[PDB]
């Protein structure tokens, strides 16, 4: 546009595909990372079904679709279907050719080595990308919120990651990975829903569970005191008319499921709560470096949007943590797009040149170019 | 009479849509504020304890100073 040339920003997860044009502050066309076929055989003739039904077109009509998700936190059940997800991204919504503008993707911390080389194969050899990089999830948001000294816990629907990044990344481990977010809460509901004459059976309607979840479901401050309150039918049940037509008086259902977050013992996992793992990462660093970590805590992700998420942390942390200085948690009121706001940062930096992979660089160091320069 | 009823029905549904829309925005406004009120209430109670603790520790420090 008579400014520069070849530039773009993108970001994908287990919820939405955040992307936009060149030099933007906020996304432009986010869409669900879904994709399925036809369990209904799509009037076979009222088109040769194909196109699994990805994008707004897919999210619109769920019934015909057997929504089979490709990338469940880390593991990619299949790469063949990924081919026609990015074919919908750059060409339909972004309206730009990938054989021109760079690309800034996100990296699920500690992702299988074999996956990186596989992805690069899809871009460089097929979609011809002469410049691109895959930054590491959390570290991005750090520079956006305006923090240089804090501990980041960025996670939404993908995977939980405790990234103590306030003066260095890639160093002692002090990081954790937990497959317990988003889809885990989306699949657990139908189970407990059975006791209330409800059952979102198939995957298509399972996706709706998440929709209603993010508009009412809240977290209990103390399950004990709210157990006796159950008698008082006022703060619990609330009339929610299902778009089709079937009221669901969610009440105790709201604060029962989220309890699993702090208590992973409800789904057969010894994984400690997100406030225990926090200790595990802090106890590794030096002794004279905790007082500043407690001062500011970066809690990001769409998972940190439900009522009663930050106040609970300040109750459990103080217990098994030093009690002398003040403790404050920085949870950006809109901390979901924290990664994208940070993506816009690195997207406009020139120092970033010493990170991405140039067309020729791949052929000069084989497929291992990724893990030979990056880390 | 049918034509007259149809005319009244057309404007009736229009007013109905407007009424429901106003109620939908009103119930939402009351909802979000109610949630904020609860968040403020919890923040008020937790600080109410800190305030007392901050006062007692001050009085204790004074008594401690009187002894020495």
């Amino acid at each position: 546009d008579e400014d520069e040339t070849t530039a773009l920003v993108c970001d994908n997860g287990s919820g939405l595909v955040k992307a936009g044009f060149a030099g933007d502050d906020a996304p432009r066309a986010v869409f669900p990372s879904i994709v399925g076929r036809p369990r209904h055989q799509g009037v076979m003739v009222g088109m040769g079904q194909k196109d699994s039904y990805v994008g707004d077109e897919a999210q619109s009509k769920r019934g015909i679709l057997t929504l089979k998700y490709p990338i469940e936190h880390g593991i990619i059940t299949n790469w063949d279907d990924m081919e026609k997800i990015w074919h919908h991204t750059f060409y339909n919504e972004l309206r730009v050719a990938p054989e021109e503008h760079p690309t800034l993707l996100t990296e699920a911390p500690l992702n299988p080595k074999a996956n990186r080389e596989k992805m690069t194969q899809i871009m460089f050899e097929t979609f011809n990308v002469p410049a691109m990089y895959v930054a590491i999830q959390a570290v991005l948001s750090l520079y956006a919120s305006g923090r240089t000294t804090g501990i980041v816990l960025d996670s939404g629907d993908g995977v939980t990651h405790n990234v103590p990044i306030y003066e260095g990344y890639a160093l002692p481990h002090a990081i954790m990975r937990l497959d317990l977010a988003g889809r885990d809460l989306t699949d657990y509901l139908m189970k407990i829903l059975t006791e209330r004459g409800y059952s979102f059976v198939t995957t298509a309607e399972r996706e709706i569970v998440r929709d209603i979840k993010e508009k009412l479901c809240y977290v209990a401050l103390d399950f004990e005191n709210e157990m006796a309150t159950a008698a008082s039918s006022s703060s619990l049940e609330k009339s929610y008319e299902l778009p089709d037509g079937q009221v669901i008086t969610i009440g105790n259902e709201r604060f029962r499921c989220p309890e699993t977050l702090f208590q992973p013992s409800f789904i057969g996992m010894e994984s400690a709560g997100i406030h225990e793992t926090t200790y595990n990462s802090i106890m590794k660093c030096d002794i004279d470096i905790r007082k500043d970590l407690y001062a500011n805590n970066v809690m990001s992700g769409g998972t940190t949007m439900y009522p009663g998420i930050a106040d609970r942390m300040q109750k459990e942390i103080t217990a098994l943590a030093p009690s002398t200085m003040k403790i404050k948690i920085i949870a950006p009121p809109e901390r979901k797009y924290s990664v994208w706001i940070g993506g816009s940062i690195l997207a406009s930096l020139s120092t970033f040149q010493q990170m991405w992979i140039t067309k020729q660089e791949y052929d000069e160091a084989g497929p291992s170019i990724v893990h030979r320069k990056c880390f | 009479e049918l034509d007259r009823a149809q005319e009244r029905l057309a404007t009736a549904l229009q007013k109905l849509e407007e009424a429901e829309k106003a109620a939908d925005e009103s119930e939402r406004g009351m909802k979000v504020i109610e949630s904020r009120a609860q968040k403020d209430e919890e923040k008020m109670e937790i600080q109410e304890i800190q305030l007392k603790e901050a006062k007692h520790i001050a009085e204790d420090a004074d008594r401690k100073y009187e002894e020495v």
Binding site: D3, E4, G23, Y143 | -
Partner: protein, 464 residues
């Protein structure tokens, strides 16, 4: 040009008088008193003279680059902003000042308080106002039109006088923004005639949704103080840039000739060379403009003209000419560069100006034309300053400002709520969407400044 051109037309010798009477006119707009030089204008103007089919002027348009838009609210002690403002406050009657919403008390305001100076013995205030009116009336701005314009300016003054206080919303030491001096922020919404509260719900708090359709404003984020004062400035400063452009352009609408068309010729005019015993951020950007002016000649009187040697068919042999000094150009364009690393440090929100300095030394201190107190042992350089070479001398800059002085970018999440109103003043601040300058609206500063400087170059490598 004239005489050699043509004559006859009685409307030709008359317009030859108004353009000569434009000297006192141009001596008010562009010119502003500095600490040292009195007639030290400060702007990047490129005036275009249009002509007719016989060879005489008909009109013209005006173009300006990125404005030193901080001049209105912030400046060095002793200096002053544009004259047109101060000459208005002391030229009108208290009766009219009340209509504007002004009170007889300079310290009461903020923008004027930050300076700490109003009445000056040298310049006469009441005597200039009547002269300004003549200038406006002589051109084509009757009192009826003047009043219509003052409402727009008076509106900005209301939205200007609001440096919000500490908002005890947080818990520990940090804080957000909230109004304590309500009548001031109320004045901002007074001219707008909208819910005073609702106004601050969309501004101080950043709302974003988007996806599928396009955006839904209501849920938002109480930003920190740095980003708070940032939007405060970006807002109060952008409105003036749009105003000036619309001010000079809408004036031409009356002056411009409709009787006939013709070609176009451009003319350049810029600030002057000033050097204090001290320096600051503003000195860097001004000197940067000169770096282009020097490069301009090099690209023209040294390069373009040199190509004319072989075009005229002359036995020419390449003679050694001093390098194209690309050490000061390549160092600030392609990846790994000054302005390239400048945008790198600025976007690291937490990183202050002090830390930015260290980001330069490590990347360079080897490429010619850059030194410091660490490498170059020279006591003249302070512990919080740095050395930079230009043409033939040395200049040591300060670090004060930079941050809020540079970025200044303004997003469309603060404009949408305002341009949705129904008033020739409110929406008037935002002319009929995109005055031939948009393409893509939301871009983090850095690039935005490049446009003002790139649009300048692109139109130089294609003309005589």
């Amino acid at each position: 040009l004239t005489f050699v051109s043509s004559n006859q037309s009685p409307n030709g010798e008359r317009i030859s008088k108004m353009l000569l009477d434009s000297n006192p006119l141009l001596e008010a707009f562009g010119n502003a008193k500095t600490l040292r030089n009195d007639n030290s204008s400060r702007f990047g103007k490129y005036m275009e003279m249009q002509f007719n089919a016989v060879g005489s002027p008909i009109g013209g348009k005006i173009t300006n680059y990125l404005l030193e838009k901080s001049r209105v609210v912030g400046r060095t002690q002793g200096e002053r902003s544009f004259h047109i403002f101060y000459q208005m406050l002391k030229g009108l009657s208290q009766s009219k000042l009340d209509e504007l919403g002004l009170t007889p008390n300079a310290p009461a305001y903020e923008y004027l308080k930050k300076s700490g100076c109003f009445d000056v013995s040298t310049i006469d205030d009441s005597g200039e106002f009547k002269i300004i009116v003549k200038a406006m009336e002589t051109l084509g701005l009757k009192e009826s039109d003047q009043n219509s314009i003052w409402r727009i300016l008076a509106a900005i003054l209301h939205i200007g006088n609001i440096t919000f206080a500490e908002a005890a919303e947080q818990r520990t030491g940090t804080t957000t923004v909230k109004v304590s001096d309500t009548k001031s922020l109320a004045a901002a919404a007074s001219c707008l005639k909208t819910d005073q509260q609702s106004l601050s719900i969309a501004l101080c708090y950043r709302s974003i949704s988007t996806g599928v359709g396009k955006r839904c404003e209501v849920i938002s984020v109480p930003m920190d103080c740095n980003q708070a004062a940032y939007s405060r400035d970006a807002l109060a400063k952008a409105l003036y840039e749009r105003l000036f452009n619309w001010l000079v352009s809408k004036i031409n609408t009356i002056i411009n000739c409709t009787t006939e068309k013709g070609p176009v010729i451009g003319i350049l005019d810029i600030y002057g060379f000033e050097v204090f015993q001290n320096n600051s951020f503003e000195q860097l950007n001004i000197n940067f403009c000169n770096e282009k002016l020097q490069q301009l000649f090099i690209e023209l009187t040294l390069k373009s003209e040199q190509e004319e040697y072989v075009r005229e068919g002359i036995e020419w042999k390449n003679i050694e000419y001093f390098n194209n000094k690309p050490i000061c150009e390549l160092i600030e364009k392609k990846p790994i560069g000054l302005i390239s690393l400048l945008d790198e440090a600025c976007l690291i929100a937490k990183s202050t100006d002090q830390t930015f300095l260290d980001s330069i030394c490590k990347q360079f201190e080897k490429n010619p034309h850059l030194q410091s107190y660490v490498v170059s042992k020279d006591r003249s350089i302070g512990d919080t300053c740095f050395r930079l070479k230009h043409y033939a001398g040395d200049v040591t800059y300060d670090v004060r400002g930079f941050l809020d002085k540079n970025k200044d970018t303004l997003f469309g999440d603060l404009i949408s709520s305002m341009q949705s109103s129904s008033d020739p003043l409110v929406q008037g601040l935002f002319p009929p969407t995109r005055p031939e300058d948009s393409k893509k609206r939301p871009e983090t500063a850095g690039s935005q400044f490049r446009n003002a400087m790139n649009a300048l170059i692109t139109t130089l490598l294609a003309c005589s």
